[PDB]
Amino acid sequence: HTTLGVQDISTTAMSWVQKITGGVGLIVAVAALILIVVLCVSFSRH
């Protein structure tokens, strides 16, 4: 009957592009946390 809202296909290919986005977000989140950790180390050092 068609006439509906996606999304739908095309798997693989679709994953190829999707995988490119969000990874860098995780990286900068981890780096942010690490910077906080080091900051706390300095706070402890003082």
Partner 1 sequence: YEHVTVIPNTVGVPYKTLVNRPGYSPMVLEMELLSVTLEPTLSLDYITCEYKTVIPSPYVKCCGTAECKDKNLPDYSCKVFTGVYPFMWGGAYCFCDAENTQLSEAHVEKSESCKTEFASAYRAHTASASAKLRVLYQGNNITVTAYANGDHAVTVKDAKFIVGPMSSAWTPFDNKIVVYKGDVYNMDYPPFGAGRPGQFGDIQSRTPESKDVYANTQLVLQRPAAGTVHVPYSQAPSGFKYWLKERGASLQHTAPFGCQIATNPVRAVNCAVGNMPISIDIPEAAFTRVVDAPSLTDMSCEVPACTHSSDFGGVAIIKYAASKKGKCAVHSMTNAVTIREAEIEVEGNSQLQISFSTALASAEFRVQVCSTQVHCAAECHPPKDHIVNYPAS
Partner 2 sequence: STNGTAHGHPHEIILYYYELYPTMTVVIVSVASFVLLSMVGTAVGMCVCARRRCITPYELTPGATVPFLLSLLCCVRTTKA
Q: What are the residues binding partner 2 (CB under 8 A)?
A: 2-6, 8-14, 16-17, 21-22, 24-25, 27-29, 31-32, 35, 38-39, 42
1 lies in the binding site for partner 1 (CB under 8 A):
yes
Q: Which residues of 5-25 are buried (b: 16+ CB within 10 A; e: fewer)?
A: eeeeeeeeeeeeeeeeeeeee
26 lies in the binding site for partner 1 (CB under 8 A):
no
4 lies in the binding site for partner 1 (CB under 8 A):
yes
Q: Measured from the CB of residue 43, what is the shortest distance to partner 2 in angstroms?
A: 12
Whole-number Å distance between alpha carbons of 40 and 37: 5
